[PDB]
Amino acid sequence: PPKTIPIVDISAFIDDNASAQAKDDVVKAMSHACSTYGFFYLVGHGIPEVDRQQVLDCARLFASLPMDEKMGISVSKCMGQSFRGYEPPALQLHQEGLLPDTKEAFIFGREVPADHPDAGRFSTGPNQWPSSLPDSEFRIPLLKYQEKMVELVKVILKILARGLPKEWNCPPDVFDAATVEPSIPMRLLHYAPQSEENKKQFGVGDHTDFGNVSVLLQEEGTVGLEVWYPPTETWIPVPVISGSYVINMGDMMQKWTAGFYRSARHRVVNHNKKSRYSAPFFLNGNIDLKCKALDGSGVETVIGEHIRQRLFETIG
Numbered sequence: 001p002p003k004t005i006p007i008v009d010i011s012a013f014i015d016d017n018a019s020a021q022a023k024d025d026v027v028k029a030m031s032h033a034c035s036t037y038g039f040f041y042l043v044g045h046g047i048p049e050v051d052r053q054q055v056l057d058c059a060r061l062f063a064s065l066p067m068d069e070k071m072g073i074s075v076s077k078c079m080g081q082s083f084r085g086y087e088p089p090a091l092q093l094h095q096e097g098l099l100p101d102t103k104e105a106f107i108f109g110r111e112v113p114a115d116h117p118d119a120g121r122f123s124t125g126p127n128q129w130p131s132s133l134p135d136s137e138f139r140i141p142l143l144k145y146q147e148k149m150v151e152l153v154k155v156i157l158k159i160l161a162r163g164l165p166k167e168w169n170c171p172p173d174v175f176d177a178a179t180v181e182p183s184i185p186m187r188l189l190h191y192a193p194q195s196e197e198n199k200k201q202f203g204v205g206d207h208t209d210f211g212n213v214s215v216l217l218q219e220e221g222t223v224g225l226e227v228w229y230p231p232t233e234t235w236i237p238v239p240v241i242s243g244s245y246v247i248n249m250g251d252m253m254q255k256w257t258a259g260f261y262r263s264a265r266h267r268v269v270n271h272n273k274k275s276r277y278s279a280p281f282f283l284n285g286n287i288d289l290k291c292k293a294l295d296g297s298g299v300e301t302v303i304g305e306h307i308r309q310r311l312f313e314t315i316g
């Protein structure tokens with residue numbers, strides 16, 4: 001029974017003039033992690049710690065808004081199925097804050113104009129921004145961070161492509177077409193503290209991510225995140241590690257690679273005595289891209305259709 005998920009330092013791919021043996025070591029480590037656990041800590045990404053802390057501060061700033069203002073940009077009011085804006089708690093009573101055992105989020109993605117023909121299609125459309133927050137304090141750093149997340153997942157994808165079975169003869173750029181005009185939702189999540197009830201409580205229940213790559217920024221604090229490892233049937237805890245992101249593969253990556261890279265069930269247990277924040281970035285990818293199974297098996301899957309199928313099947 002493994003006690004931890006692996007750590008991968010990708011400095012060799014971020015820094016200049018790294019040896020080919022160092023790069024190959026990165027490739028092998030990431031490939032093994034993603035084909036065994038579907039999860040790993042990533043360090044060496046080069047994103048300044050001040051930028052990461054600024055993102056968590058944006059999460060806290062948004063949550064501090066009163067409920068009526070947040071509800072003003074509720075995801076109910078977004079365009080079509082773009083799913084942008086404020087995702088409210090399941091229960092609420094007051095303008096300020098959250099009831100225990102609840103959560104809220106701000107969700108934003110790639111900015112697509114309202115008059116664009118694709119606007120309102122799945123995960124595609126204009127963002128909703130809270131008008132009371134100054135741009136220098138919210139929208140601007142979030143969009144700059146989104147730029148950095150896009151660069152990071154492109155590097156991750158190149159490492160993943162170099163880690164596929166050699167008999168498949170996959171180029172290092174096999175995944176790159178998913179990163180053009182992609183669905184890239186990011187959430188600023190606020191979890192309330194646990195309640196006093198004497199039953200297990202979760203910030204997120206048992207699930208898989210549906211997309212390609214997920215990039216999670218955690219806040220210093222209690223362990224929430226756990227990863228289901230089937231062979232030993234055990235939940236691996238994923239504590240916060242300074243400087244790292246938690247990376248995991250989603251269902252679309254698992255489909256694309258014919259099961260070689262695993263999309264693992266995970267959950268967040270609520271052991272927080274105070275509000276906790278997190279910021280996951282999700283590469284779903286170009287919703288219209290037709291992905292052929294990389295083992296040459298001739299199977300074809302459209303990213304948007306796959307994710308909508310997963311949403312329709314993930315009901316109860």
Ligand SMILES: O=C(O)CNC(=O)C(=O)O
Nearest residue numbers: 204216224225268278280
């Ligand atoms: O906040 C966390 O620890 C993990 N987040 C998720 O699984 C999610 O937002 O889908």
Ligand SMILES: [Mn+2]
Nearest residue numbers: 207208209266
């Ligand atoms: Mn998840």
